[PDB]
Amino acid sequence: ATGDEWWAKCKQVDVLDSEMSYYDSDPGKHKNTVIFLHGNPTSSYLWRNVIPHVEPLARCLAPDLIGMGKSGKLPNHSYRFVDHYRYLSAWFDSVNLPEKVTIVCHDWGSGLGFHWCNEHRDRVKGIVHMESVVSPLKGWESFPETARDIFQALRSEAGEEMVLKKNFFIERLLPSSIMRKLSEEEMDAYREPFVEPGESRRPTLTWPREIPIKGDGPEDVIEIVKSYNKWLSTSKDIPKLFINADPGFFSNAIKKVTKNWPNQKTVTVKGLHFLQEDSPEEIGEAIADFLNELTK
Secondary structure (H helix, E strand, O other): OOHHHHHHOEEEEEEOOEEEEEEEOOOOOOOOEEEEEOOOOOOHHHHOOOHHHOHHHOEEEEEOOOOOOOOOOOOOOOOOHHHHHHHHHHHHOOOOOOOOEEEEEEEHHHHHHHHHHHHOHHHEEEEEEEEEOOOOEOOHHHOOHHHHHHHHHHOOOOHHHHHHHOOHHHHHHHHHOOOOOOOHHHHHHHHHHHOOOOHHHHHHHHHHHHOOEOOOEOHHHHHHHHHHHHHHHOOOOOOEEEEEEEEOOOHHHHHHHOOOOOOEEEEEEEEOOOHHHOOHHHHHHHHHHHHHHHHO
16 A cells, blocks of 8 residues: 555666666566556556456566656656657566567556557557557647646646646646545655655656647657557557546547547446546456456
8 A cells, every 4th residue: 555565566677777666476477467557647556456456367567667656767857758668668678578468558658558569569469558648639629628728838838847846747637637535645655756856756747748739749759659549540450458437538539539449348437537546446357357358
């Protein structure tokens, strides 16, 4: 339950010019393996109540993205999508994975995971995604109205004071998209990587600045997302599970974007954006069922 208790189950490995922390239920084993990828502004802690439903069937890994959780902070403060992907790709190559894996992913963890799958198509046995980055936004009009002003502010010069000084993503956006009230210990686990004001919080500001918005940018992320969206939309041989959150945040838009994707099943659970905090049991059970279907 505590951050301390969760990270006590994790390990650290040197990766490139830094280090990454990750959960690994069965180090080095090439049995059925599942990788859980968090997004902004969370960490592997997000999966703590989902993973126990899956471990009996698979080796479960859950890394903290660079700059987040207990992974290292980068002294150039550069945490763009491409930086995260460079680190995550090196992490995949460092943890002794079997020939194919299942990816379970959320938010920017899905951006990174979908891109990794697109670049390593023969390594993918299935993808479970939720509140995910499935396509570029055609414009600001497609961003949910209740959050549109906030995210435009985050992407403006005001973002630095909002995040680096006031920790806006941790203190306001995170609890706003959990239906229940987190305990003090749970909230402190999310706060821990970002307790010190300043550049430690940069990952939580750069992430909203990477959202692919057509006509705005950033162009490199737009191209990456367009590329994996094209692959996913015709990926008839890759089993996919979309965990829809009711009422969710981006879930309603994801349902429409992916309605014609082949080989995708949908399950619905109660939640806003951070659905793992409201329905971890149903999410874990849905993943376990999905894995069993692969094994037949």
